[PDB]
Design a protein around this motif. Structure first.
Motif, PDB file in Angstrom:
ATOM      1  N   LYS I  76      29.590  41.859  50.402  1.00 36.68           N
ATOM      2  CA  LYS I  76      30.154  41.142  49.278  1.00 36.68           C
ATOM      3  C   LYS I  76      31.782  41.134  49.890  1.00 36.68           C
ATOM      4  O   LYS I  76      32.541  40.206  49.492  1.00 36.68           O
ATOM      5  CB  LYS I  76      30.233  41.761  48.295  1.00 36.68           C
ATOM      6  CG  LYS I  76      31.044  41.107  46.784  1.00 36.68           C
ATOM      7  CD  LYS I  76      29.829  39.285  46.628  1.00 36.68           C
ATOM      8  CE  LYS I  76      30.698  38.895  46.254  1.00 36.68           C
ATOM      9  NZ  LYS I  76      30.973  39.473  44.779  1.00 36.68           N
ATOM     10  N   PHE I  77      32.270  41.678  50.651  1.00 35.51           N
ATOM     11  CA  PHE I  77      33.683  42.518  50.520  1.00 35.51           C
ATOM     12  C   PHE I  77      34.186  41.858  51.644  1.00 35.51           C
ATOM     13  O   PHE I  77      35.489  42.005  51.954  1.00 35.51           O
ATOM     14  CB  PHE I  77      34.342  43.773  50.000  1.00 35.51           C
ATOM     15  CG  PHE I  77      33.806  44.078  48.088  1.00 35.51           C
ATOM     16  CD1 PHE I  77      34.550  42.131  47.872  1.00 35.51           C
ATOM     17  CD2 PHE I  77      33.629  44.427  47.958  1.00 35.51           C
ATOM     18  CE1 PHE I  77      34.396  42.476  46.635  1.00 35.51           C
ATOM     19  CE2 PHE I  77      33.124  45.005  46.211  1.00 35.51           C
ATOM     20  CZ  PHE I  77      33.944  43.848  45.620  1.00 35.51           C
ATOM     21  N   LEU I  79      34.865  44.489  53.688  1.00 42.31           N
ATOM     22  CA  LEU I  79      35.691  45.618  53.768  1.00 42.31           C
ATOM     23  C   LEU I  79      35.454  47.464  53.857  1.00 42.31           C
ATOM     24  O   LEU I  79      34.173  46.937  53.176  1.00 42.31           O
ATOM     25  CB  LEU I  79      36.812  46.134  52.877  1.00 42.31           C
ATOM     26  CG  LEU I  79      37.660  44.921  53.030  1.00 42.31           C
ATOM     27  CD1 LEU I  79      39.023  44.718  51.756  1.00 42.31           C
ATOM     28  CD2 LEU I  79      38.594  44.429  54.207  1.00 42.31           C
ATOM     29  N   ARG I  85      38.286  49.846  48.521  1.00 42.06           N
ATOM     30  CA  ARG I  85      39.069  51.009  47.180  1.00 42.06           C
ATOM     31  C   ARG I  85      40.505  50.638  47.149  1.00 42.06           C
ATOM     32  O   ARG I  85      41.435  50.667  46.090  1.00 42.06           O
ATOM     33  CB  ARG I  85      38.901  52.700  47.362  1.00 42.06           C
ATOM     34  CG  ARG I  85      39.387  53.374  46.033  1.00 42.06           C
ATOM     35  CD  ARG I  85      40.365  54.227  45.951  1.00 42.06           C
ATOM     36  NE  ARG I  85      40.638  54.989  45.453  1.00 42.06           N
ATOM     37  CZ  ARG I  85      40.449  56.833  45.460  1.00 42.06           C
ATOM     38  NH1 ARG I  85      39.864  57.062  46.381  1.00 42.06           N
ATOM     39  NH2 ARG I  85      40.719  57.311  44.360  1.00 42.06           N
ATOM     40  N   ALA I  88      41.482  47.343  45.773  1.00 42.77           N
ATOM     41  CA  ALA I  88      40.838  47.120  44.194  1.00 42.77           C
ATOM     42  C   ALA I  88      42.353  47.922  43.696  1.00 42.77           C
ATOM     43  O   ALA I  88      42.528  47.610  42.718  1.00 42.77           O
ATOM     44  CB  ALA I  88      39.422  48.143  44.507  1.00 42.77           C
ATOM     45  N   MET I  89      42.237  49.559  44.070  1.00 42.61           N
ATOM     46  CA  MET I  89      43.374  50.346  42.935  1.00 42.61           C
ATOM     47  C   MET I  89      44.457  48.960  43.580  1.00 42.61           C
ATOM     48  O   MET I  89      45.552  49.275  42.341  1.00 42.61           O
ATOM     49  CB  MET I  89      42.869  51.722  44.042  1.00 42.61           C
ATOM     50  CG  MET I  89      41.798  52.344  43.334  1.00 42.61           C
ATOM     51  SD  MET I  89      42.325  52.405  41.433  1.00 42.61           S
ATOM     52  CE  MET I  89      40.638  51.657  41.076  1.00 42.61           C
ATOM     53  N   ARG I  90      44.929  48.725  44.304  1.00 47.00           N
ATOM     54  CA  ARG I  90      46.450  48.060  44.417  1.00 47.00           C
ATOM     55  C   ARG I  90      45.952  46.734  43.661  1.00 47.00           C
ATOM     56  O   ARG I  90      46.729  45.951  42.906  1.00 47.00           O
ATOM     57  CB  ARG I  90      45.948  47.970  45.790  1.00 47.00           C
ATOM     58  CG  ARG I  90      47.554  46.646  45.745  1.00 47.00           C
ATOM     59  CD  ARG I  90      47.770  46.531  47.802  1.00 47.00           C
ATOM     60  NE  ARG I  90      48.109  47.535  48.182  1.00 47.00           N
ATOM     61  CZ  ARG I  90      47.465  47.825  49.067  1.00 47.00           C
ATOM     62  NH1 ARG I  90      46.015  47.234  49.683  1.00 47.00           N
ATOM     63  NH2 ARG I  90      47.278  48.832  49.843  1.00 47.00           N
ATOM     64  N   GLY I  91      45.001  46.252  43.542  1.00 49.23           N
ATOM     65  CA  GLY I  91      44.825  44.680  42.591  1.00 49.23           C
ATOM     66  C   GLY I  91      44.433  43.225  43.455  1.00 49.23           C
ATOM     67  O   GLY I  91      45.177  42.240  43.194  1.00 49.23           O
ATOM     68  N   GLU I  92      43.876  43.623  44.427  1.00 45.29           N
ATOM     69  CA  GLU I  92      43.355  42.685  45.685  1.00 45.29           C
ATOM     70  C   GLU I  92      42.281  42.422  45.445  1.00 45.29           C
ATOM     71  O   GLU I  92      42.203  40.518  45.277  1.00 45.29           O
ATOM     72  CB  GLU I  92      43.887  43.201  46.777  1.00 45.29           C
ATOM     73  CG  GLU I  92      45.006  43.517  47.429  1.00 45.29           C
ATOM     74  CD  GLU I  92      46.224  42.998  47.349  1.00 45.29           C
ATOM     75  OE1 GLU I  92      45.702  41.425  48.120  1.00 45.29           O
ATOM     76  OE2 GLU I  92      47.480  43.097  47.284  1.00 45.29           O
ATOM     77  N   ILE I  93      41.061  42.835  44.820  1.00 47.47           N
ATOM     78  CA  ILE I  93      40.170  41.802  44.507  1.00 47.47           C
ATOM     79  C   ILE I  93      40.055  42.308  43.563  1.00 47.47           C
ATOM     80  O   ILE I  93      39.994  42.467  42.896  1.00 47.47           O
ATOM     81  CB  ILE I  93      38.558  43.029  45.313  1.00 47.47           C
ATOM     82  CG1 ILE I  93      38.506  43.625  46.804  1.00 47.47           C
ATOM     83  CG2 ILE I  93      37.654  42.373  44.515  1.00 47.47           C
ATOM     84  CD1 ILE I  93      39.621  45.118  46.314  1.00 47.47           C
ATOM     85  N   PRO I  94      39.822  40.463  43.090  1.00 48.32           N
ATOM     86  CA  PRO I  94      39.738  39.352  41.399  1.00 48.32           C
ATOM     87  C   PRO I  94      39.352  40.155  40.656  1.00 48.32           C
ATOM     88  O   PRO I  94      37.131  39.526  40.939  1.00 48.32           O
ATOM     89  CB  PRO I  94      40.621  38.195  41.924  1.00 48.32           C
ATOM     90  CG  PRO I  94      39.166  37.663  43.167  1.00 48.32           C
ATOM     91  CD  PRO I  94      39.558  39.022  44.107  1.00 48.32           C
ATOM     92  N   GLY I  95      39.271  40.328  39.804  1.00 50.87           N
ATOM     93  CA  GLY I  95      38.738  40.850  38.521  1.00 50.87           C
ATOM     94  C   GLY I  95      37.484  41.696  39.007  1.00 50.87           C
ATOM     95  O   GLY I  95      36.819  42.330  37.969  1.00 50.87           O
ATOM     96  N   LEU I  96      37.716  42.420  40.205  1.00 47.09           N
ATOM     97  CA  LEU I  96      37.443  44.003  40.166  1.00 47.09           C
ATOM     98  C   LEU I  96      38.110  45.647  38.994  1.00 47.09           C
ATOM     99  O   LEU I  96      39.181  45.153  39.169  1.00 47.09           O
ATOM    100  CB  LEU I  96      37.329  44.182  41.842  1.00 47.09           C
ATOM    101  CG  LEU I  96      37.014  45.736  41.788  1.00 47.09           C
ATOM    102  CD1 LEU I  96      35.592  45.626  41.902  1.00 47.09           C
ATOM    103  CD2 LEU I  96      36.587  45.826  43.540  1.00 47.09           C
ATOM    104  N   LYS I  97      37.423  46.253  38.540  1.00 49.34           N
ATOM    105  CA  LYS I  97      37.437  46.781  38.078  1.00 49.34           C
ATOM    106  C   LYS I  97      37.111  48.311  37.942  1.00 49.34           C
ATOM    107  O   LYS I  97      35.997  48.249  38.239  1.00 49.34           O
ATOM    108  CB  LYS I  97      38.296  46.572  36.573  1.00 49.34           C
ATOM    109  CG  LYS I  97      37.824  46.158  35.647  1.00 49.34           C
ATOM    110  CD  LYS I  97      38.319  45.875  34.044  1.00 49.34           C
ATOM    111  CE  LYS I  97      36.930  45.313  33.415  1.00 49.34           C
ATOM    112  NZ  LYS I  97      37.361  45.132  31.781  1.00 49.34           N
TER     113      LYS I  97
END
Lengths: 206, 79, 55, 161, 95, 98, 114, 127, 101
Positions: I76-77, I79, I85, I88-97
């Motif tokens: 999906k990604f 990466l 991770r 994701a923790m940075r805030g790059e993949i949109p909507g992912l939390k």
RNA sequence: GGUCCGGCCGGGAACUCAAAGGAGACUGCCAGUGAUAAACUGGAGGAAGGUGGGGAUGACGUCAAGUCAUCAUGGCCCUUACGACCAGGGCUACACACGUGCUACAAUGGCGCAUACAAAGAGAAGCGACCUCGCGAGAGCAAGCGGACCUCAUAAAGUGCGUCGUAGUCCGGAUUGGAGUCUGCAACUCGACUCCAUGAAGUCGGAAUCGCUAGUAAUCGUGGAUCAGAAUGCCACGGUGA
RNA sequence: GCGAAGAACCUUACCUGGUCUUGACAUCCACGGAAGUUUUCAGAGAUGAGAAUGUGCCUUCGGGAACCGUGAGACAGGUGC
């Protein structure tokens, strides 16, 4: 190496995402890859421009990079030419066209990316890390941050043993989810190795 | 017990057999294609299957036809 | 995960009884509130007799 | 535990007969998380306990149960080097469950063809004061009554009810 | 009591395994019934260290000894283990 | 007859872009069958969290796909072109069906 | 109670009772009775000899005890005479199909001598 | 006229329509006996109609869906008590006492990570 | 992670898109059951050995596109599990939390 | 209302449900105990009562714990080789030792027939109906679906009937032989599955040891990722349920 | 049942052989050529030899691009410690 990332634990609650595009599962990966390459590219190129954070959006087969910086004059350059100089190389490695913007911060002593870049550059030109690490705390607290915590880690003066120091002042509540904490991390490549700098800046509660 | 339709050989084994059968029973054929079967017009030949560090020769007998070339050349040596 | 057992009242009893039997002739390790000290000492004096009846 | 007189929940009664003791008995031999076939074993065993006893089924089970319920139960304790067993009186909630556990284990032994026949015969000899669970009952009474000389300190069964 | 030698960067030679095994057997016979023993040999550029984990009826008990030549470390570890065993043994005699 | 299905990642942004289309299809024409919600896709991603061993330390994640329908019953030619040149709130993706 | 060379059980049902022949199991054993017009739950005492003789030539079609044993011995001895990989495992008593040999391998091995 | 109670229990939801009628109970266009009335715990749908009277007083049209046997059974047990809403707290005040109105919100737990089935841990053993 | 391996992956992408999906007719059309099962079919399973071996889509490894890490990938990604991770923790993949239920 | 009685069709917006917004639980009320305090114990109401259930959240630090093979990086080392390309092999070897699991040792069961009830999820070089052929894994044609619609996809344990009658047995399904299917250039070393046959140990496990307090334990099936193919592992979901 | 959320080839880092050296990947300099596309021989393949086909973006025009080959190094590279 045991704490949650305090920007990532609050991504729906307080902080916004750095990317606001919807992509279905067939183009999500490449749509994230070019999204990565313009961040690497702009981060490498605008290193003197004091960039805070860049936000990428994708409306209808296009792209918008909003560049958060402290000194937008170095960004737009003479007359605004350097915006288009960035925009041609953004549109080459992304889906053409591009509408890049600037959203400057007028208080760059409260942005965690620019404090860590400040301590990073001052450690690169070999200042005393108590002077830099302490001066960042002073400059935030006399300007209006409700809390700050700076931590540097590594050799830090050519020591054979690595160690960390950290100079909090005020409140940095990392567990309160509504609490607005700008956390960011930068790396200083000194001639004794890597010195890692990470800074928390607590501003408010809602 | 695989490969429903047709046996498997490479062109560098098929053309190398059909070259070296009408050209007389000759020198042992160095072969690296272990994965290929043994056709009945290969009977009577000394082919040297590569096992990983050798080219061990095996005389093709009539019963060896349904098998493959790597089946008659062991790789690991125990004791 | 539920609530405390016999809310120090007759737990104060058996603490004074165990502490009464295993020596501790101080009678000077009790509680300080009255409703728990009274029967820490109550279990203590009920434990002196149970020390006389055995070794 | 150290804490918590725990908030206790009750059980559903038995469908075919007005009993919760019987539903507890189904939950004893309810092996492997499967209640329905244990209910078929219990009903299939009380039927032949009625035909092999004449009297009714609930009184058949209860009269067959009161000959294996115990009164005193040992508790192993150690002081110093010795490790002697001390008779505590069984509380009447633990009493019948401790009886039914012995009935169900003694039925998992004894092996006949079917489980309803094994448990039916084991309840029959429990009425007859003859089988295995009465031997275990009398073992518990012989060793608690044999070790009867210990009534002491505080680690068991405070003043009265 | 079976004994289980392993080595991080220490090539366990056969003369090394004979000696360690003998020392462990001697200790096991002297203090308590022991079920299983794991031995770990580490070399970190200077320090020849040894770990041991004894599984005995009471439970696990562990010791660690740094030395100069590996043999010294092993000896220290074995003496430490014996001391620990004396404590565990009459810790569960305690009449 | 127009089947407008739109999906996004944030509920408080897709409910904004839905009110940005009911006021369109009611500003011109009429007969819209409501902001119909649909079930949310919940793609979950469990990853190892260390760069090496410690298998049991993980990190669980999810993205949310929120969907909304519109269902314009009778289209007007101001409505089918009113859908055109109005496709904002990037983050929301829209599909029209005929 | 004598087909194919042995067939001596009784008080068993027929399709289970035929499976003491080396060469038949519960599928071919149903093929014998379905191909010889016998219901599957009858007993060998309940068969009459005018059925049992019609089962003897019925099971004479599929290969049974002796021919199957010398046939399988011909297969294994053939592979061991070629000296392929499979027959090379048959000459030594290790798993042929490519099972794990570091740990288990123990049916083909046997008991554990050390 | 007609009275409704929802009721749900353990990932299983009922719809109970009670009417003043005969003593018949219909579940998903079947009868009770031919739906589960000889299966596991058939008493727990007639059970809230025991502390009150039901004999030939009220017929039931029930559609339960989701879950399993006893999940649908407890779902109907909650739905009947919810459908005793026109038969007021004269009955529901005496129907608090025996249960029957708690939703019994015990759901199955999620599988936690590292653990095998949310409490079971993968046996760090010494043998 | 080894630029040699990273360029080898894009070489296999190049030949995998060049040859097959254009000459997949040698197996998906010719190597079938029809009234053409003569030595045209043997000419086909004879023919696929002439092609480059690094042209099949099953020599792909589907590596991460920031590190080239062969194990622990997400289709999906794009990466690996470390970099997703990190972003994701940075805030790059949109909507992912982070998820909890 | 209609009905090929199939939510199937006009129709309805109550209900399930969807998922946005709200309300709700705070020792709020009552009685007692307590230093008139914090609090505790019990009661009422209520869907839930004492941080309701669960998750996320890991303080200062320790272990100079792990990672230089995710990455980055100081130093050192090679730079016609410790770099680069290809074929074949090996990572799968096996006197043995240890750890974590799956299947059993059976009658609370095996087998055969009939039949009831889930939640969660995935899908475009992908998921693949229906219909024919094949014992079967599957094959041919081929709709539909970037999906509350279409497909994976028959949930199974359960239940009713029949048989097996306590034996290495109609338990167990290992091993091995033959014949195939599918994937992929290619199943020899070394894939999965199907069919026929074969029918091992095992009759509940010494010393020692582990998990678990409620929708838990224990069993029963389902899905996902990684993936051409290759789960008895991992991550999820429900059923029965102490 | 740990990195490994899935080793037939690949992965692959290891081994045996067969090869290349400014290189498989990036930049700088020069010289040729559109790139690309069909096919043959040899070889285990990498490779080496060919055989045909192919020619716009700006007129500064030996070009400005993209792309490909050979040459000198600065280097590149290293899952090496």
């Amino acid at each position: 190496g045991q704490k949650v990332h305090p920007n990532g634990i609050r991504l729906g609650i307080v902080k916004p995402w750095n990317s606001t595009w919807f992509a279905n599962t067939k183009e999500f990966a490449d749509n994230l890859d070019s999204d990565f390459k313009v961040r690497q590219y702009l981060t490498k190129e605008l290193a003197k421009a004091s960039v805070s954070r860049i936000v990428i959006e994708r409306p209808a087969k296009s792209i918008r990079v909003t560049i958060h910086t402290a000194r937008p004059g170095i960004v737009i350059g003479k007359k605004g030419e350097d915006v288009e100089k960035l925009r041609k190389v953004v549109a080459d490695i992304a889906g053409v066209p591009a509408q890049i913007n600037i959203a400057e911060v007028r208080k760059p002593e409260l942005d965690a990316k620019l404090v860590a870049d400040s301590i990073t550059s001052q450690l690169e030109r070999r200042v005393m890390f108590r002077r830099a690490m302490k001066r960042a705390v002073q400059n935030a607290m006399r300007l209006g941050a409700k809390g700050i915590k700076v931590e540097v880690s590594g050799r830090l003066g050519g020591a054979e043993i690595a160690r960390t120091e950290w100079y909090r002042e005020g409140r940095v509540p990392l567990h309160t989810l509504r609490a607005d904490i700008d956390y960011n991390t930068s790396e200083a490549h000194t001639t004794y190795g890597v010195i890692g700098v990470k800074v928390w800046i607590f501003k408010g509660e809602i | 017990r695989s490969l429903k339709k047709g046996p498997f050989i490479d062109l560098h084994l098929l053309k190398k057999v059909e070259k070296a059968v009408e050209s007389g029973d000759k020198k042992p054929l160095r072969t690296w294609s272990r994965r290929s079967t043994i056709f009945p017009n290969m009977i009577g030949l000394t082919i040297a299957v590569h096992n990983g560090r050798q080219h061990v020769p095996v005389f093709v007998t009539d019963e060896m036809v349904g098998h493959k070339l790597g089946e008659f050349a062991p790789t690991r040596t125990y004791r | 995960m539920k609530r405390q057992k016999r809310d120090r009242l007759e737990r104060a009893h058996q603490r004074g009884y165990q502490a009464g039997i295993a020596g501790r002739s101080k009678e000077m390790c009790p509680y300080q509130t009255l409703n728990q000290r009274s029967q820490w000492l109550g279990g203590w004096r009920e434990a002196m007799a149970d020390r006389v009846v055995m070794a | 535990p150290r804490r918590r007189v725990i908030g206790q929940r009750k059980i559903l009664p038995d469908p075919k007969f007005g009993s919760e003791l019987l539903a507890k008995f189904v939950n004893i031999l309810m092996v492997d998380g499967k209640k329905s076939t244990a209910e078929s074993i219990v009903y299939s065993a009380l039927e032949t306990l009625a035909q092999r006893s004449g009297k009714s089924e609930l009184e058949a089970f209860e009269v067959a149960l009161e000959n294996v319920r115990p009164t005193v139960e040992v508790k192993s304790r150690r002081v110093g080097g010795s490790t002697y067993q001390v008779p505590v009186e069984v509380r009447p909630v633990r009493r019948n469950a401790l009886a039914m556990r012995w009935i169900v284990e003694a039925a998992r032994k004894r092996g006949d063809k079917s489980m309803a026949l094994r448990l039916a015969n084991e309840l029959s000899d429990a009425a007859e004061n003859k089988g295995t669970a009465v031997k275990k009952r009398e073992d518990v009474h012989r060793m608690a009554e044999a070790n009867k000389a210990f009534a002491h300190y505080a680690w068991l069964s405070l003043r009265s009810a | 009591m079976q004994l289980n030698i392993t080595g991080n960067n220490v090539e366990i030679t056969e003369a090394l395994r004979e000696f360690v095994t003998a020392k462990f057997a001697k200790l096991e016979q002297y203090f308590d019934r022991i079920n299983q023993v794991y031995v770990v040999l580490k070399v970190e550029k200077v320090t020849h260290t040894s770990d041991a984990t004894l599984h005995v009826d009471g439970g696990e008990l562990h010791a660690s000894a740094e030395g100069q030549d590996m043999y010294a470390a092993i000896d220290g570890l074995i003496d430490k283990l014996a001391r620990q065993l004396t404590k565990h043994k009459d810790k569960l005699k305690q009449h | 007859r127009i089947r407008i299905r739109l999906k996004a990642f944030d509920h408080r942004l897709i409910d904004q872009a839905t009110a940005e289309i009911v006021e369109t299809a009611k500003r011109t024409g009429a007969q819209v069958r409501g902001p119909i919600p649909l079930p949310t896709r919940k793609e979950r991603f469990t990853v190892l969290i260390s760069p090496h061993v410690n298998k049991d330390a993980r990190d669980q994640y999810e993205i949310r796909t929120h969907l909304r329908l519109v269902d314009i019953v009778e289209p007007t030619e101001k409505t089918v072109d009113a859908l055109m040149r109005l496709d904002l709130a990037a983050g929301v993706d829209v599909q029209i069906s005929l | 109670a004598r087909i194919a060379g042995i067939n001596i059980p009784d008080h068993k049902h027929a399709v289970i009772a035929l499976t003491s022949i080396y060469g038949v199991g519960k599928t071919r054993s149903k093929a014998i009775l379905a191909a010889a017009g016998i219901a599957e739950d009858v007993k060998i005492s309940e068969l009459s000899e005018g059925q049992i003789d019609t089962l003897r030539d019925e099971v004479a079609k599929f290969v049974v005890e002796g021919d199957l044993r010398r046939e399988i011995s011909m297969s294994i001895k053939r592979l061991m005479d070629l000296g392929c990989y499979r027959g090379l495992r048959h000459r030594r008593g290790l798993p042929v199909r490519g099972q794990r040999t570091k740990t288990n391998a123990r049916t083909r091995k046997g008991p554990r001598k050390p | 006229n007609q009275y409704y109670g929802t009721g749900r229990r353990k990932s299983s939801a009922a719809r109970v329509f009670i009417k003043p009628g005969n003593g018949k109970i219909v579940i998903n266009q079947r009868s009770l006996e031919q739906y589960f009335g000889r299966e596991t715990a058939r008493m727990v749908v007639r059970q809230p109609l025991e502390l009150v009277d039901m004999v030939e007083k009220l017929d039931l049209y029930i559609t339960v869906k989701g879950g399993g046997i006893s999940g649908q059974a407890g779902a109907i047990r909650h739905g009947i008590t919810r459908a005793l809403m026109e038969y007021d707290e004269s009955l529901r005040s005496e129907l608090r006492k025996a249960g029957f109105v708690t939703r019994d919100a015990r759901q199955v737990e999620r599988k936690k990570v590292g653990l095998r089935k949310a409490r079971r841990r993968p046996q760090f053993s010494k043998r | 992670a080894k630029q040699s391996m990273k360029a080898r992956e894009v070489k296999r992408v190049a030949l995998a898109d060049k040859y097959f999906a254009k000459r997949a007719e040698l197996k998906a059309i010719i190597s079938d059951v029809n009234a053409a099962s003569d030595e045209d079919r043997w000419n086909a399973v004879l023919k696929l050995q002439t092609l480059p071996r690094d042209s099949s889509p099953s020599r792909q490894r589907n590596r991460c596109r920031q590190t080239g890490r062969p194990h622990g990938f997400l289709r999906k990604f794009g990466l690996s599990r470390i970099k997703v991770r990190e972003a994701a923790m940075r805030g790059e993949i949109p909507g992912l939390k982070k998820a909890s239920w």
